[PDB]
Design an enzyme around this catalytic site. Sequence first.
Site, short mmCIF file in Angstrom:
data_model
loop_
_atom_site.label_atom_id
_atom_site.label_comp_id
_atom_site.label_asym_id
_atom_site.label_seq_id
_atom_site.Cartn_x
_atom_site.Cartn_y
_atom_site.Cartn_z
N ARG C 32 0.81 -1.23 0.00
CA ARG C 32 0.00 0.00 0.00
C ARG C 32 0.85 1.29 0.00
NH1 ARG C 32 -3.34 -2.68 5.06
NH2 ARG C 32 -4.61 -4.20 3.87
N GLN C 54 10.90 -10.70 3.80
CA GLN C 54 9.82 -11.64 4.05
C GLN C 54 10.05 -12.97 3.34
OE1 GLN C 54 6.68 -12.00 1.49
NE2 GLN C 54 7.12 -13.97 2.45
N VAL C 55 10.40 -12.91 2.06
CA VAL C 55 10.75 -14.09 1.30
C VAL C 55 11.89 -14.89 1.95
CG1 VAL C 55 11.73 -14.87 -0.90
CG2 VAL C 55 9.80 -13.23 -0.87
N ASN C 56 12.96 -14.23 2.42
CA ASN C 56 14.08 -15.00 2.99
C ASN C 56 13.66 -15.65 4.30
OD1 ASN C 56 15.46 -13.92 0.83
ND2 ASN C 56 17.20 -13.21 2.03
N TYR C 60 13.60 -19.71 5.11
CA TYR C 60 14.30 -20.36 6.22
C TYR C 60 13.38 -20.95 7.29
CZ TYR C 60 19.04 -19.72 4.93
OH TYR C 60 20.28 -19.90 4.38
N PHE C 95 14.48 -8.64 9.72
CA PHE C 95 13.41 -8.07 8.89
C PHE C 95 13.35 -6.53 9.04
CE2 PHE C 95 9.04 -6.81 8.07
CZ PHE C 95 8.73 -7.54 6.92
N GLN C 96 13.34 -6.06 10.29
CA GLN C 96 13.43 -4.61 10.56
C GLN C 96 14.67 -3.85 9.95
OE1 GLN C 96 12.96 -4.83 14.87
NE2 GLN C 96 10.73 -4.43 14.69
N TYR C 98 16.63 -4.98 7.35
CA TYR C 98 16.50 -5.03 5.91
C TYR C 98 15.51 -3.97 5.47
CZ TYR C 98 17.20 -7.62 1.51
OH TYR C 98 17.57 -8.01 0.25
N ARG C 105 20.46 -5.26 7.74
CA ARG C 105 19.93 -6.61 7.85
C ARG C 105 21.07 -7.56 8.29
NH1 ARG C 105 22.30 -7.40 3.11
NH2 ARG C 105 22.58 -9.52 2.26
C1 GTX Z 1 -1.27 -16.75 10.34
C2 GTX Z 1 -2.30 -15.91 9.63
C3 GTX Z 1 -1.86 -15.29 8.35
C4 GTX Z 1 -2.39 -13.95 8.01
C5 GTX Z 1 -2.68 -13.73 6.58
C6 GTX Z 1 -2.83 -12.32 6.13
S1 GTX Z 1 -2.83 -12.11 4.38
C7 GTX Z 1 -1.18 -11.71 3.88
C8 GTX Z 1 -0.40 -12.31 2.74
N1 GTX Z 1 0.68 -11.40 2.51
C9 GTX Z 1 1.88 -11.94 2.02
O1 GTX Z 1 1.93 -13.14 1.79
C10 GTX Z 1 3.03 -11.07 1.76
C11 GTX Z 1 4.01 -11.66 0.81
C12 GTX Z 1 3.61 -12.14 -0.53
N2 GTX Z 1 4.72 -12.89 -1.05
C13 GTX Z 1 3.25 -10.99 -1.42
O2 GTX Z 1 4.07 -10.60 -2.29
O3 GTX Z 1 2.14 -10.39 -1.29
C14 GTX Z 1 -1.02 -12.51 1.38
O4 GTX Z 1 -2.02 -13.22 1.22
N3 GTX Z 1 -0.31 -11.85 0.31
C15 GTX Z 1 -0.65 -11.87 -1.09
C16 GTX Z 1 -2.07 -11.73 -1.43
O5 GTX Z 1 -2.66 -10.66 -1.09
O6 GTX Z 1 -2.65 -12.68 -2.04
C1 GTX Z 2 21.20 -24.29 8.47
C2 GTX Z 2 22.04 -23.06 8.55
C3 GTX Z 2 21.82 -22.04 7.49
C4 GTX Z 2 22.99 -21.26 7.01
C5 GTX Z 2 22.72 -19.84 6.70
C6 GTX Z 2 23.72 -19.14 5.85
S1 GTX Z 2 23.19 -17.58 5.23
C7 GTX Z 2 22.55 -17.84 3.61
C8 GTX Z 2 21.26 -17.31 3.03
N1 GTX Z 2 21.39 -17.45 1.62
C9 GTX Z 2 20.21 -17.67 0.88
O1 GTX Z 2 19.15 -17.71 1.48
C10 GTX Z 2 20.27 -17.83 -0.57
C11 GTX Z 2 18.98 -17.56 -1.25
C12 GTX Z 2 18.24 -16.29 -1.04
N2 GTX Z 2 16.93 -16.49 -1.60
C13 GTX Z 2 18.96 -15.15 -1.70
O2 GTX Z 2 18.54 -14.70 -2.80
O3 GTX Z 2 19.99 -14.65 -1.17
C14 GTX Z 2 20.84 -15.88 3.24
O4 GTX Z 2 20.68 -15.40 4.36
N3 GTX Z 2 20.61 -15.16 2.00
C15 GTX Z 2 20.19 -13.79 1.87
C16 GTX Z 2 20.81 -12.81 2.77
O5 GTX Z 2 22.07 -12.66 2.69
O6 GTX Z 2 20.08 -12.18 3.59
#
Ligand code: GTX
Ligand code: GTX
Lengths: 147, 147, 147
Positions: C32, C54-56, C60, C95-96, C98, C105
């Site tokens: 929004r 959020q994706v990362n 994990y 998350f905060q 990043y 991050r």
């Molecule tokens: C434990 C209860 C969970 C609460 C659910 C609230 S709805 C939020 C949910 N938001 C997300 O997933 C954010 C990331 C998602 N990858 C995106 O890009 O929108 C969603 O449906 N996003 C995409 C959409 O609007 O379809």
């Molecule tokens: C079981 C123990 C796990 C070991 C953790 C090592 S850190 C690696 C981790 N790397 C990834 O997730 C790779 C894919 C990720 N989707 C990306 O695009 O960077 C990460 O934090 N990537 C993104 C970032 O740097 O924030």
Amino acid sequence: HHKDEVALLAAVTLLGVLLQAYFSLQVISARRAFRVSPPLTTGPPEFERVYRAQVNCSEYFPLFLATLWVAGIFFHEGAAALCGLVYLFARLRYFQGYARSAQLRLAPLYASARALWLLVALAALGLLAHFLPAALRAALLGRLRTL
Amino acid sequence: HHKDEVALLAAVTLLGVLLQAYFSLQVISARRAFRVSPPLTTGPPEFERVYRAQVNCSEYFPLFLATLWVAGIFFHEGAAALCGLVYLFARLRYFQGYARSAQLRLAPLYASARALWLLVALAALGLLAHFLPAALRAALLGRLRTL
Amino acid sequence: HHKDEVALLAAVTLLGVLLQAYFSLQVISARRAFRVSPPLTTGPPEFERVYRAQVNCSEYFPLFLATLWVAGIFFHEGAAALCGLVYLFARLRYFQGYARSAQLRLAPLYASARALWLLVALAALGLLAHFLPAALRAALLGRLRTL
Ligand SMILES: CCCCCCSC[C@H](NC(=O)CC[C@H]([NH3+])C(=O)O)C(=O)NCC(=O)O
Ligand SMILES: CCCCCCSC[C@H](NC(=O)CC[C@H]([NH3+])C(=O)O)C(=O)NCC(=O)O
Ligand SMILES: CCCCCCSC[C@H](NC(=O)CC[C@H]([NH3+])C(=O)O)C(=O)NCC(=O)O
Ligand SMILES: CCCCCC/C=C/CCCCCCCC(=O)O
Ligand SMILES: CCCCCC/C=C/CCCCCCCC(=O)O
Ligand SMILES: CCCCCC/C=C/CCCCCCCC(=O)O
Ligand code: NI
């Protein structure tokens, strides 16, 4: 065995796996229809909508599993399973809607979230029921104490 | 304890976690090699292939876990673990293939899917074995009934 | 019941679900604020950073769950739960950070990885403790044998 206490949770779980698989095959089919080859996840709007529906479902699937099991173990197996069934149905409708139009994904999305929060609330209540009495007792005893 | 009935499932699970971690570190290494800094997940084809291999593996990893545990509990622990090992090996080969070329990801992909559906089939049969007798009995009794 | 042996794991699990939900709602709020409508996950840097955080975290989250449960069952429930709490807190900070800047991050990222590997190490030690004695015995017996 404790199979009897969790078989419905396991069944709903398996149903969820099957549904995700279904989503995946639908994405491969959109990859063929609108000619999008791996890697690369950009293309026509309709493909991006199918892809995106699948991605969101995938991202929420572990949340669903965790809460389903916690609610089913700590609160009540049947209730948790029911919410899970509703959730999954809601997710099927979400994926179909999104595939047709971004706006049509919205109603089943809300339905899926209500079911999921209900699962959360059941998980939370069950955990509260488990931990709160011992805690209150310990607190009363410490007060007692006096004496 | 029920540790004995699930230790192999737990071991395969841990192996899967380790493999995913491995994929993640490989993605960070491709981020350095082909100079791609976060956020932003677009770059040269080779990076996009490594990234994409990791993403697909991540998306399938919960499906694998769920079915592994259900199959291992409801059907047979050892069989489920074996399929899991094959699956994971297949996924390692998928990631390596994809990293080299989109086409070379394909053979291990198919191998991973066969193993995964086998896990599904074992999960399904085990659940069927659990629920179907009681259901048939209840149905026969209701027919009986007459009387 | 075995609820008592796993209630803390279940509580941390539920906390993790809640935290993920929180991340999701934050992504909808960035959608929004910076005017990004579904599908399509590209936009201003700040949105891309929130989305990406959020994706990362989502990617994990299953690794965390698997290891948490294995460590908690095979090694020690309390230790595993503690590491889980630290991990989750670290992820909230990730998350905060990043969301504010890619560089901020990084510190909570490292914190989250240490906690996660600790969980792995506990899982590994617990599994080692379970399997290694029987294996050594079997090996000694086979040597014995002579005789
Ligand atoms: C434990 C209860 C969970 C609460 C659910 C609230 S709805 C939020 C949910 N938001 C997300 O997933 C954010 C990331 C998602 N990858 C995106 O890009 O929108 C969603 O449906 N996003 C995409 C959409 O609007 O379809
Ligand atoms: C079981 C123990 C796990 C070991 C953790 C090592 S850190 C690696 C981790 N790397 C990834 O997730 C790779 C894919 C990720 N989707 C990306 O695009 O960077 C990460 O934090 N990537 C993104 C970032 O740097 O924030
Ligand atoms: C429970 C059994 C599971 C059945 C497996 C069938 S294979 C389908 C699987 N398809 C998907 O994951 C779709 C989404 C994926 N994110 C993509 O963009 O291709 C795949 O491997 N996609 C990418 C690829 O071709 O490598
Ligand atoms: C990561 C997803 C969560 C996994 C949690 C499942 C763990 C279950 C272990 C305990 C089960 C014992 C039998 C059930 C007892 C009861 O119904 O009260
Ligand atoms: C989300 C992934 C699935 C988690 C499921 C694991 C739950 C296990 C609880 C019951 C286990 C009881 C011991 C095993 C009994 C048996 O082998 O027959
Ligand atoms: C996919 C995530 C992992 C799920 C694993 C959970 C399965 C638990 C089943 C066995 C639990 C039996 C009670 C605990 C015994 C003990 O503390 O030693
Ligand atoms: Ni028991």
